[PDB]
Design a protein around this ligand. Structure first.
Ligand SMILES: NC(=O)c1ccc[n+]([C@@H]2O[C@H](COP(=O)([O-])OP(=O)(O)OC[C@H]3O[C@@H](n4cnc5c(N)ncnc54)[C@H](OP(=O)(O)O)[C@@H]3O)[C@@H](O)[C@H]2O)c1
Ligand SMILES: NC(=O)c1ccc[n+]([C@@H]2O[C@H](COP(=O)([O-])OP(=O)(O)OC[C@H]3O[C@@H](n4cnc5c(N)ncnc54)[C@H](OP(=O)(O)O)[C@@H]3O)[C@@H](O)[C@H]2O)c1
Lengths: 285, 285
């Protein structure tokens, strides 16, 4: 049961290993031949060329930093893409994802977009899930295999959907990392150790589920009551974090961006509305 | 025991109600006399003047949008402050918090800073905790009372500590709300309802604790291994969220701020380091 995988970053590697562990034969190629050494030891079969990698399997998985990478690699293997199934598990733009769907299918391949929503350490484990979008019939044919990487959430036949859901998750995630480090940087400025603050940050993030249901209701109904907490008070909070950041001499870009949401809401007259009203100035009309 | 409280936002109100529920007499004043109606019904006693509010109790709690508000109000009760204990549960800057400590003590009162780390709906419940800082001996005298609002976490005698820990929490929190709304705004741009995405966002936030321990270790040791996930790949992710945001016509300030962290890390040569390396570019010189 030979499946190909191209791109042997942590993810590519962790995926190749799960495919090998569950009986499948796995052909690999990577720009840096020597990164494959570990998985080749485990049972994978390295090959000289990207075309050889594509020719080896029906199913071809890509784990690459961006879609530009798909073009650099598959560009040296076009004649062999015919009859094949590209599953691209790379981050890039939804718009660039569709543009990619069209190029691979013009070269005669079926294209599915995927987004893996776990670190490599948890690929193949219980917490693992993967956004997928594109041909439902082709996805079904290879579901059993892809299901090993993590729980497949098929979103629809619009190839952009998985990428859009991936960018959306990482929007929150990269924000939470940057926010965490920013808040930590504020406390370390006054000489507090990170280990004394981290438990509070943990609770902070773990408590987010409490707010999210009321938030979705308020946002979809355009109903933003400030009774519990208004944009004037939370705008002031944003102003304080910015000014504390300048006082401490840490980064101001991230808190100035949060303040800008409150500033635009205030300008739009949502002073007395719920913080959910920020959605009105964030969204596309 | 009569405890005074000034500022009858949702917080002030929820705190007054808990004090009344646990036997305490509560004197109130507010710039907007009619906001007291609810708590006066519940048992509180409104008074004409801020000076009267201060004179009524040993312990005086402030729940105000900012510290500037404390000055406007307590400014009309300067003579009345001798012997009193101000607990300021308002957001403002650590620097403005100390400057306030000194102003209050100059007028013969003890000053404690506090940060309440729950919404009004959870004041007095299990999840409730409150950062406190200032004189430990004065804090002990009034601990039993304040303990009702939420679990008191006394940080130290540096009055700024509670404010610093509050700003830090809201730094992450306001970021998480803005990120959540931003990601949601991306999904609604392609016409997906927010109810389809919210469960994934909930899991995303609930999963933050997994990364935070490894993060603190890597940050405090200046040890940033990229083996599992490097700043080149996560910088590219940030670029994708920004470009998807421009494509969708939503806010770009928040993702452009996250991208700016990755861009500065890359500039500092941390391309191949862990995302924890962003801390090097966020932290003070
Ligand atoms: N890191 C995580 O925990 C995680 C989790 C979920 C999803 N993801 C996403 O899934 C993918 C996993 O990436 P990763 O962190 O494992 O690795 P990465 O650092 O993004 O790079 C992975 C692969 O991309 C190749 N590559 C990049 N640009 C190329 C180009 N122009 N030409 C040829 N090859 C190119 C690399 O070649 P070399 O090895 O030769 O450099 C490598 O094999 C990414 O798209 C990421 O956004 C990551
Ligand atoms: N709400 C939350 O979820 C939350 C979370 C934790 C803690 N906090 C913090 O607790 C404080 C109050 O919270 P909140 O949202 O309930 O209240 P708020 O909306 O910020 O205002 C509360 C009180 O401040 C008074 N006030 C504001 N500016 C004033 C001024 N210049 N002169 C006189 N009175 C003034 C208001 O008087 P009026 O009634 O006349 O406007 C009101 O009684 C803030 O520092 C906030 O950041 C809020």
């Amino acid at each position: 049961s030979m499946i190909t995988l191209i791109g042997l970053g942590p993810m590519g590697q962790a995926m190749v290993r799960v495919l090998l562990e569950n009986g499948h034969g796995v052909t690999v190629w990577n720009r840096t031949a020597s990164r494959a050494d570990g998985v080749v030891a485990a049972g994978a079969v390295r090959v000289d060329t990207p075309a050889d990698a594509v020719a080896a399997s029906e199913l071809v998985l890509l784990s690459l930093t961006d879609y530009a990478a798909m073009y650099d690699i598959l560009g040296k293997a076009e004649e062999a893409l015919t009859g094949k199934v590209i599953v691209n598990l790379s981050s890039d733009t939804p718009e660039k994802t569709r543009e990619a769907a069209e190029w691979v299918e013009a070269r005669g391949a079926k294209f599915i977009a995927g987004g893996v929503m776990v670190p490599a350490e948890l690929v193949g484990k219980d917490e693992a899930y993967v956004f997928y979008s594109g041909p439902a019939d082709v996805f079904e044919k290879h579901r059993e295999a892809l299901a090993l990487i993590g729980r497949p959430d098929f979103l629809g036949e619009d190839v952009r959907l998985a990428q859009l859901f991936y960018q959306a998750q990482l929007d929150i995630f990269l924000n939470s990392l940057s926010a965490f480090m920013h808040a930590s940087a504020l406390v370390r400025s006054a000489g507090v150790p990170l280990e004394k603050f981290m438990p509070y940050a943990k609770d902070n993030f773990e408590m987010m589920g409490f707010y999210l249901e009321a938030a979705v209701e308020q946002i979809e109904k355009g109903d933003h009551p400030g009774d519990e907490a208004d944009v004037i008070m939370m705008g002031a909070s944003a102003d304080h974090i910015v000014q504390a950041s300048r006082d401490a001499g840490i980064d101001v870009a991230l808190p100035e961006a949060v303040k800008s949401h409150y500033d635009r809401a205030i300008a739009a007259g949502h002073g007395r509305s719920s913080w959910t009203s920020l959605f009105e100035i964030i969204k596309a009309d």
